[PDB]
């Protein structure tokens, strides 16, 4: 009974992060010890003529990016654990997330390490036009 959400290639990393005190640090450490990044993300088919903004209502990848379903790029959504926000709610679930193509092999790790500029809406170091 029920419907599977996951594949065996992610069992180890998701179990490790689901038990960790610090899930983001555990994911970073798992990668540094030679582990494979989380796969089975929701990658979108799009026209690559989007705005390039980081977090959007519909896919907005430009030619330097890929668009993904937001929950699938969030370590806390993937492990079904608490979000480290005051109210415990997610900023990626229910949105699409644009990821630079050069980082698209690890969308979960990308969102853990990077920050969106509040002024222009683009990733700091990957599109932000503020400085």
């Amino acid at each position: 009974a029920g419907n599977a959400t996951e594949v065996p290639a992610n069992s180890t990393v998701l179990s490790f992060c689901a038990f960790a005190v610090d899930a983001a640090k555990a994911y970073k450490d798992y990668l540094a010890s030679g582990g494979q990044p989380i796969t089975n993300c929701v990658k979108m088919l799009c026209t690559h003529t989007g705005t390039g903004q980081a977090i959007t209502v519909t896919p907005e990848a430009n030619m330097d990016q890929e668009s993904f379903g937001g929950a699938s790029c969030c370590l806390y959504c993937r492990c079904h654990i608490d979000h480290p926000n005051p109210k415990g709610f997610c900023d990626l679930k229910g949105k699409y997330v644009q990821i630079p193509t050069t980082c698209a092999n690890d969308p979960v790790g990308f969102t853990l390490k990077n920050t969106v500029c509040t002024v222009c809406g683009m990733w700091k170091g990957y599109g932000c036009s503020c400085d």
Binding site: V21, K93, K95
Partner: protein, 286 residues
Amino acid sequence: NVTGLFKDCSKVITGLHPTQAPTHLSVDTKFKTEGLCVDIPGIPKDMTYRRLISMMGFKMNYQVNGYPNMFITREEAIRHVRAWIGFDVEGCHATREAVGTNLPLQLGFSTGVNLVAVPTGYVDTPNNTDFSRVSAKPPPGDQFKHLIPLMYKGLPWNVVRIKIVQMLSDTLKNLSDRVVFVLWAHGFELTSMKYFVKIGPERTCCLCDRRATCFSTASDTYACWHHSIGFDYVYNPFMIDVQQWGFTGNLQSNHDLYCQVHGNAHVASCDAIMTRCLAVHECFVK
């Protein structure tokens, strides 16, 4: 190839919107095309779902520098016999809004303690995972009749985990710097540990040089068994599955080969006492 870990146990026929699905597998078929997913204009997200997510099937087989192994060898367990605590859990089944997973109901230890939890599960929603009470029932059958009254005597998990830490700390503080949970067929015991165990690199206590055995979500601090009052999580426990030592039948039949002072009273604590006892006879007697 799929796994049962994080299986969606809801009764909703359809999958999720691409922005809400945790994985490609969980996106509804209607969005799948050309090897990927598409956003379909006019097809909205679902803003009211509650989908129970199964915690059955954890695999603690990672090798990450600085993080200890949870599962240990028979030889390592033997050196730490003073840390042995038999552990068994009897579960109840998800019902009504969900089906297909087991939730911890009675947690039993070789100390003779049984703790009863409110049936609680990990329910995905549009905004987060809600760790909450879920509809449940004991499995049907005369061997599971004793669990019926326990369905209304449970304590909330925030209380249960404090009690586990207090019990382990009182039992082990003068015996060992760690805990080794002694298990028989570990799958459900490992699922139950998700509710009261955290892991990470080896740490020292906040008030001394002993290794940390407990963690507090109140202050994000670590403590040994002596300094853990009020602490809510067991930190970096160890464990061993006795069934993986070559036994062929059930727990009781193997326990009874070496011991006769532990009559099966059919409770989680009795299974926990029998598992520790069998391991002790196998490693130390004759």
